Design a binder for this molecule. Sequence first.
Ligand SMILES: CCc1cc2ccc(CN3CCN(c4ncc(C)n4C)CC3)cc2[nH]c1=O
Length: 350
Amino acid sequence: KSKLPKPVQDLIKMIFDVESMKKAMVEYEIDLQKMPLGKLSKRQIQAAYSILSEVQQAVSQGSSDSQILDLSNRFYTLIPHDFGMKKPPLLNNADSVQAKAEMLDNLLDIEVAYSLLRGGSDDSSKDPIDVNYEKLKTDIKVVDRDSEEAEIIRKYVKNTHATTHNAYDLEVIDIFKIEREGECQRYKPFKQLHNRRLLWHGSRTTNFAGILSQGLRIAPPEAPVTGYMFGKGIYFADMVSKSANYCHTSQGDPIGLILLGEVALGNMYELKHASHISKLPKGKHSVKGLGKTTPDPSANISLDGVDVPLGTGISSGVNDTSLLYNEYIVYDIAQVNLKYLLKLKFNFKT
Ligand SMILES: CCc1cc2ccc(CN3CCN(c4ncc(C)n4C)CC3)cc2[nH]c1=O
């Protein structure tokens, strides 16, 4: 039997749940009979991203819907979708490209999680929770509820739930302190950079075995850059609810996971509208998407020499922006040092 704390054991059970991986694929309208979990490969995902990039070019160059039908069918050939003896919807627009790139980004994390379960050793004398914990190459510790670090984290959650995300409220169940093997060493060129901030990143529970083993990653070269608002980077928010929306929890599955990462932002390239960039302008280290609302800067605090923007939301004074809240993007995986993982209960009012 495992000696791991019960909250860590429950976390491991959650992120390696095979039935949850299947459900995520069903949600993504994938045909499980034609493409089951075991059949998912990096090669097929990579080939589907390329078709998506082909669709991105045909949509921008104003190709006919007749010409687009063949690229759309090509996509469904690589990634079977659930329809039956039916005709699938046309991938003939930017919204379609964006939704399919988002789906493939999720399939990459699910493939990692499933490859970790199949690629190891089999020993019935060891607790399978202990076996799976070791596959993550991450030290996971429970943060004491009464500590100052837990108080700062709970205040950050409490103060940054946006009014426009009023459909649910959040309850912090567990706070974990996480240390991914070799991540601190990788972060070393950025450890003293200015503007280091503790920011949120939400994701589906089915992505966390991939996030903990491989860290936060950028979409591959084959992925269509126009499929992402600020291009292929790693996205963060300073508002908990903006990130919690990415958990995709529901009344039937209300437990979600969200990260707190130290992000070395440096000189930020400030943007108000979409810019599908391939690289940053010289001297810039990140992108800050300017929101209409920002946490109150007078309420900024320090937790281990890093800024924590835990103030309640106030007007940023920024006009004519496509964003309600800020977002931060980095384009080098080394600019992120994952610090905490929170298990949250969503209480829906709807
Ligand atoms: C503004 C805050 C924010 C933005 C946000 C945007 C998108 C995703 C979805 N993630 C799917 C898996 N994905 C991936 N997994 C593997 C690869 C190679 N990639 C690219 C990374 C992206 C989650 C997000 N959470 C947030 O809190």
